[PDB]
Design a binder for this molecule. Sequence first.
Ligand SMILES: CCOC(=O)Cn1/c(=N/C(=N)N)sc2cc(O)ccc21
Ligand code: NA
Lengths: 27, 147, 10, 102
Amino acid sequence: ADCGLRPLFEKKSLEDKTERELLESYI
Amino acid sequence: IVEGSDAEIGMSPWQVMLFRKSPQELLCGASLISDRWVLTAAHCLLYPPWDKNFTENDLLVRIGKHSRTRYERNIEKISMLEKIYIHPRYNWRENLDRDIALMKLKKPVAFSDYIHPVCLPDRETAASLLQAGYKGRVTGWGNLKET
Amino acid sequence: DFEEIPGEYL
Amino acid sequence: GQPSVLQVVNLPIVERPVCKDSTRIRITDNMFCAGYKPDEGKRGDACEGDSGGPFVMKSPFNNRWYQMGIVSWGEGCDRDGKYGFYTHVFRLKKWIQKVIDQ
Ligand SMILES: CCOC(=O)Cn1/c(=N/C(=N)N)sc2cc(O)ccc21
Ligand code: NA
């Protein structure tokens, strides 16, 4: 499936302004 | 959402707005999980204490939206409900246990830059990520403040 | 305070 | 009191004892809670109108977004010592799959 990959972000390798806050919490 | 910020364009392309037809108003949020299936909270559709018991014809789902009130021509798609399915063991009487519902759409929605389904977790993704301190993201057009 | 939607979606 | 556009907030999952100790309501395994503690400084919560929306997480394993929760309930909005509760999507996925498979 193509689920959960956003055309304007993941699909273009662009990050949104706060997604890094999620990643940093996954310790 | 309280103490949030404006979403970026296309930041949450699975976000769905549940929209009441007559009195036109926001009912609830929801999410797109395939071209025909939308996931929501059972209490958005059935909650006796608040005199809520919507039928398919009472509502529309609006997909690809960003603006709360504006009609987003060429961007949002508005879909009609074929069928509502509420968890048979949804506990509206006590604690909202199993607060879940599915809505099948009449026609499939076309995916676009603004409309795209989210994944549902497998056992392993759930096990790894559902840990205290790990952050998730909530989105919606609900109140900015309690009062 | 919602903008009107097209009537085709009823 | 109402936003012009879609709102977003990132919130940490809360330890289950802390969720249970914040409320008189009986919590079940089909729920989890999220939000900052009073000690933590940062704030944020869902509120009425937000229900039914998704609580999503971005897998660091495959860079895909997963819907882990459904905005379900809270007592007030963004009150200190209170938290938002969310439907545990994985625990109800067998029902999800059953309905879709029709
Ligand atoms: C039937 C009860 O529904 C709700 O409690 C919805 N809801 C609220 N409702 C009201 N308190 N009127 S506040 C709240 C916070 C959240 O973090 C999530 C949902 C939510
Ligand atoms: Na709080």
